[PDB]
Copies of this chain bind each other. A is one copy, B any other.
Amino acid sequence: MRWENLFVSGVAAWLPPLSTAQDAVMAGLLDPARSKLRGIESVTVASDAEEDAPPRMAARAARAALGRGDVDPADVSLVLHSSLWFQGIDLWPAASYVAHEAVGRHVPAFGLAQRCNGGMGAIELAGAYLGSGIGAGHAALLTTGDRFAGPRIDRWNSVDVTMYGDGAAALVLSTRDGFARVLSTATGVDNSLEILARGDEPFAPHPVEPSPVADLGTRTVRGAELADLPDLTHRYIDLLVAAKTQALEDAGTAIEDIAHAVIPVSRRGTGHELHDLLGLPDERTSWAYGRTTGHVGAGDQYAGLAHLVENALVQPGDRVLLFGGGAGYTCTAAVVEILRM
């Protein structure tokens, strides 16, 4: 999709302190060979205090993002809150809390689930919503937030390809103006890969209690065996190249003109990495930053863009590729042009 009137008016991350892979190895929580393979140096870790529940971190990130774009909360017509896991209280609309605290009483709020891709996918849904004439306002607030905890989640081991960081991020879209223009979005998808995210786990009538420790690495392996596809890996490559190519082509931008690409935090550590598939070197990606935060739920792309802007790592005229991807498997990409700093 080529966007003629869609802007990022603000972006922010609210992140707790860093905790190092080194300290996890020293404490016996993380196998040292795994630490070395994956290349992740540290991950953000929140306290267990109520003030650090995901919706409250999200509400703070939202305020920061709305403050920086000087958007009147009266002009926000939609709130989307994406996440991966528990929000602190069950049977309860977390998204309405985020909206109430950051914007106000009279804005429609949805929780969104598209696993790791939720932040990027929300951009398409919100952009469509803003252009449709449903709401009178010109902005949408997009938030993410998660805080991982035992017994269910071991941040260092529950996923093979990454390590989980706690925290929240926010991105405010506008059809009026902003410091960046969204030039394009495009989604690649292959829903056959959903099997890799459940493995041989049976459908249970009730959450399993007490919670065993999650092991998504082992789901992927069992998932691959049950699916018995001859071309598993290609299905991934195809959907990722589709998202990349359409996002670039609809933005009228060649890959050599991308100043920086913000990607999901993950690492194989052996052969080809995502950056090889994207056709650009490691140092033009957000890996150097991401390997300090870990995988911050659905918010890697918002947090990474926040990092670039806050540190003047981009200037006006630069084009930035935001690259999603999450279990499903779904990947939304976007090209953003910096207009003002």
List residues of chain A with CB under 8 Å of any chain B CB: 1, 48, 50, 53, 55-56, 84-86, 88-97, 99-100, 104-115, 121, 124-125, 127-129, 131-134, 147, 149-152, 185, 187, 189-194, 197-198, 201-207, 209-211, 214, 216, 326-330, 332
Q: In the complex, how many angstroms separate the beta carbon of A241 from the nearest chain B beta carbon? A: 14
Q: How far is the CA of A82 from the CA of B131 in the complex (A)?
A: 23
Among A96, A197, A207, max chain B CB count under 10 A is at A96
Q: How far is the CA of A90 from the CA of B208 in the complex (A)?
A: 9
- Determine chain A's interface SS by DSSP, over half rule: loop
Q: How far is the CA of A139 from the CA of B327 in the complex (A)?
A: 24
Give this chain's copy count. Answer: 2
Q: In the complex, how many angstroms separate the beta carbon of A167 from the nearest chain B beta carbon? A: 14
* Contact assessment for B96 and A91 in the assembled complex, using a CB-CB cutoff below 8 Å: no
Q: In the complex, how many angstroms separate the beta carbon of A155 from the nearest chain B beta carbon? A: 12
Q: How far is the CA of A114 from the CA of B189 in the complex (A)?
A: 24
* Contact assessment for A113 and B89 in the assembled complex, using a CB-CB cutoff below 8 Å: no
Given A105-B190, A190-B106, does the pair A113, B112 have CB atoms closer than 8 Å? yes
* Contact assessment for A328 and B187 in the assembled complex, using a CB-CB cutoff below 8 Å: no
Q: In the complex, how many angstroms separate the beta carbon of A248 from the nearest chain B beta carbon? A: 16
